[PDB]
Amino acid sequence: MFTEIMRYVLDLGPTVMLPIVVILFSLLLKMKPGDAFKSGIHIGIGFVGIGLVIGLMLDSIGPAAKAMAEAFDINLKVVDIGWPGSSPMTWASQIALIAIPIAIVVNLVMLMTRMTRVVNVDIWNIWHMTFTGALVHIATGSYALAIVGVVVHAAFVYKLGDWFAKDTRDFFGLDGIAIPHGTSAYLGPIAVLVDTVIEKIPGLNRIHFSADDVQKRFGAFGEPVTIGFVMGLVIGLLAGYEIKAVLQLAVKTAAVMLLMPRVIKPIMDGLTPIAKQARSRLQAKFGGQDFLIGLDPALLLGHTSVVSASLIFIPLTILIAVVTPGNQVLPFGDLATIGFFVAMAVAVHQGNLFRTLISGVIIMSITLWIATQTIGLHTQLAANAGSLTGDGSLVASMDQGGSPITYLLVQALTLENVIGLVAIGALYGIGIFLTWRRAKRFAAQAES
Amino acid sequence: MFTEIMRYVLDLGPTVMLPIVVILFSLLLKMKPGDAFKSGIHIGIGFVGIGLVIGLMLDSIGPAAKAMAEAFDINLKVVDIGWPGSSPMTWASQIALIAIPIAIVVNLVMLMTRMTRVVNVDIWNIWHMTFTGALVHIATGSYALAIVGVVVHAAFVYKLGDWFAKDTRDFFGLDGIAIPHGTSAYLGPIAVLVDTVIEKIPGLNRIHFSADDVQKRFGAFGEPVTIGFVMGLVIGLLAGYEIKAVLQLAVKTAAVMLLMPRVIKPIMDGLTPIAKQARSRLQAKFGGQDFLIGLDPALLLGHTSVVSASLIFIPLTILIAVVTPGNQVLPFGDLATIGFFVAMAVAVHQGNLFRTLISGVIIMSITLWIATQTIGLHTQLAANAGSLTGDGSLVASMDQGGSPITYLLVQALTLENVIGLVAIGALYGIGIFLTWRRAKRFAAQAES
Ligand SMILES: CCCCCCCC/C=C/CCCCCCCC(=O)OC[C@H](O)CO
Ligand SMILES: CCCCCCCC/C=C/CCCCCCCC(=O)OC[C@H](O)CO
């Protein structure tokens, strides 16, 4: 049955499934069988560590952030269940398993018609696409309209990996990798718009503040590890922790700033030989068709700037939630892994924390406002998965709940808040246009 | 008073308290302030990662070994509770908190009287000493004899750090570091005996199964990472796991071989700048004498040749427990980290799996046999700690329970089985004599 062969391939995990597809690629690419095996193990090993550092993030940074929001006594009565809560609900929809073959086919069609360079192999991030269908299915009521949302969610991110290819390869050091999924990509265009505006504003276009400058004025006290200690201290202090817990958390936050890059290196260390052999064999067929592998946006968290933005925005997002007019959602389950949101924002600004701070507030305010506009649809998905206890408490999430993709599609096929559609649609649409044009220059520059 | 501050110094953690001593020492050495902080933080990051990888060993390789051993739940009716059960029991003894100052004073007296060169900073593995005293207290009924056993254990392990210092540097890369605590060091004298016997037998002295020889023969299939995958497959199969869990475990058993070296390096990188400055200042004052810092035995598992033996000996330590004469103890809790038993054996035999296998079988048989002869004390150590029911189920553990130190100390002051005292004491005593000679030989070679 399709469901078993999929639910077996799904529950197999990236620890096993992804190595095999990478090994099978090298075996048919005339690579020595031992060398092909060696890469697959490293790719899986990196994912084991990636689950470990992220496990540290959600079990030490998460508890503190979840306590800061409660300590900051506000009126926000709806709690961000986060992507740890959104994904289980999304996998309970009737389109959960039918989306995975659909997304590949949209990729396969686009690959043949020369509409994408991304050959996605991360079949686990499709829950983001299922989320767009799930909320459309709830609002519209058409099984096809939900399926169409999956195709749109797939085709968009497949090009979101194309448009951020130089940013992933040159800034994050991920050659041949495209990061199409997750908040890092689909909120990327918002940052491409902000950095576009700032560059044309005089004076504002000359303000800089990179983490390298902190090390060029403080030394050991400006090193990324040291910042991970001080910021970890404040997160514990602002959460009412005792001096023991504050001191203990700070090293764990610092340990992220060192271990996280080390756990993502195995994937790069193993993917390098396969790409070069394939690049030595596919340039003579398809013709210079530099392909890209689609992987988890977790590989973007191995940047010292991203982790610094992640810890810095833990208190900021709680304040952005208060300030943001119209918001009723309290940040919670997505506060630990919040560098996912502002990841590609740092890449666009190339390290300028000044623009990263401006982008993040715009990013967080919009995602917090959108999640407030999807509380009703989100709570139905929770009920449609058994996650709604007898309380009936409103269920909302910043991940996928505040997605412009999922929102702009629902508000188009329903026409509830046209004013919301116009403002968000123009804001996101311009960002998509500017993100697409930036890649056009990049291709012409490199080729010539 | 003392108990309150002791727990606070203890509960603050190896991640927070060890940086404090390191930071203060560098400030004492007139080192730069920020340069002192950076070394302290990296050590904490090192111990954060150690807990993460040592938790993957316990939570993934553990249940696999706990499943293989369950086949023999019928013959061996006493279960090795392991160090995850022996350590808590030993921390409830009356001699627990008093053992920290007692062991530090012994180190000071031995350091001042120029009897040892180890400056132990792991005030957390002192429970091994408290275990020796506690069982002596249960057996002899004397508080003094319990304290005497603590001091004798402290004196032996402090001397064990000196005598196994070349191995920790030449074979492990832990310069200026001694590993005095743990099953690795105090069963090391057995390995020195096995090497001596084999090197005197003709033909058997010329058998080499080293890791490097494995790599040239196999290639990428003999590399440390690939070896862990293969053994992870067998461990999964022998535990009755499904095909997927066999494959999922195998990548995680290989991830330990790669991730563990990279979580201990921050401790090395933090301690290195301090060691050279301490050499620069204290050289002339202390007569050009080289000191060693005493840390956890977990830094010995960063050797790919040890993790392999930690997987190879998971089935063997079980199979040994069926043929060992007079064994009522089923290995269990210590199997996930069984490399903690044969660590220094790998260094003495210089990574020769032939001599490691012969040595390891001797060590496990002796510990399993001794663990059978210490059950009554262990079952009372649980009763006095509250970890017991009225069922009559007996408690045993190969960690500290099957310890030659605790057994020989108990059997000397009680004289229950004089035959067992003579046999274990002779083999251990001959080994200690061979171990001390090794230190004298190496020091004279250094002067040359
Ligand atoms: C630069 C590239 C990107 C450009 C992006 C431009 C803005 C996109 C927004 C579209 C929403 C348009 C309005 C949708 C509704 C149309 C009118 C309608 O049907 O309204 C019915 C309602 O009942 C009346 O009150
Ligand atoms: C290989 C090592 C060789 C060298 C080994 C050297 C050992 C030195 C021991 C000193 C402890 C002296 C005994 C201290 C016991 C005090 C007990 C006590 O307090 O007794 C009164 C109490 O009320 C009763 O319950």
Automatic annotation (TrEMBL), chains A, B:
<keyword id="KW-0762">Sugar transport</keyword>
<feature type="transmembrane region" description="Helical">
    <location>
        <begin position="91"/>
        <end position="113"/>
    </location>
</feature>
<dbReference type="GO" id="GO:0005886">
    <property type="term" value="C:plasma membrane"/>
</dbReference>
<keyword id="KW-1003">Cell membrane</keyword>
<keyword id="KW-0813">Transport</keyword>
<feature type="transmembrane region" description="Helical">
    <location>
        <begin position="418"/>
        <end position="436"/>
    </location>
</feature>
<feature type="transmembrane region" description="Helical">
    <location>
        <begin position="178"/>
        <end position="198"/>
    </location>
</feature>
<feature type="domain" description="PTS EIIC type-2">
    <location>
        <begin position="6"/>
        <end position="436"/>
    </location>
</feature>
<feature type="transmembrane region" description="Helical">
    <location>
        <begin position="12"/>
        <end position="29"/>
    </location>
</feature>
<feature type="transmembrane region" description="Helical">
    <location>
        <begin position="218"/>
        <end position="239"/>
    </location>
</feature>
<dbReference type="InterPro" id="IPR004703">
    <property type="entry name" value="PTS_sugar-sp_permease"/>
</dbReference>
<protein>
    <submittedName>
        <fullName>PTS galactitol transporter subunit IIC</fullName>
    </submittedName>
</protein>
<feature type="transmembrane region" description="Helical">
    <location>
        <begin position="329"/>
        <end position="348"/>
    </location>
</feature>
<keyword id="KW-0812">Transmembrane</keyword>
<feature type="transmembrane region" description="Helical">
    <location>
        <begin position="41"/>
        <end position="58"/>
    </location>
</feature>
<dbReference type="Pfam" id="PF03611">
    <property type="entry name" value="EIIC-GAT"/>
</dbReference>
<dbReference type="GO" id="GO:0009401">
    <property type="term" value="P:phosphoenolpyruvate-dependent sugar phosphotransferase system"/>
</dbReference>
<feature type="transmembrane region" description="Helical">
    <location>
        <begin position="298"/>
        <end position="323"/>
    </location>
</feature>
<keyword id="KW-0598">Phosphotransferase system</keyword>
<dbReference type="InterPro" id="IPR013853">
    <property type="entry name" value="EIIC-GAT"/>
</dbReference>
<keyword id="KW-0472">Membrane</keyword>
<dbReference type="GO" id="GO:0015577">
    <property type="term" value="F:galactitol transmembrane transporter activity"/>
</dbReference>
<dbReference type="InterPro" id="IPR013014">
    <property type="entry name" value="PTS_EIIC_2"/>
</dbReference>
<feature type="transmembrane region" description="Helical">
    <location>
        <begin position="134"/>
        <end position="158"/>
    </location>
</feature>
<keyword id="KW-1133">Transmembrane helix</keyword>
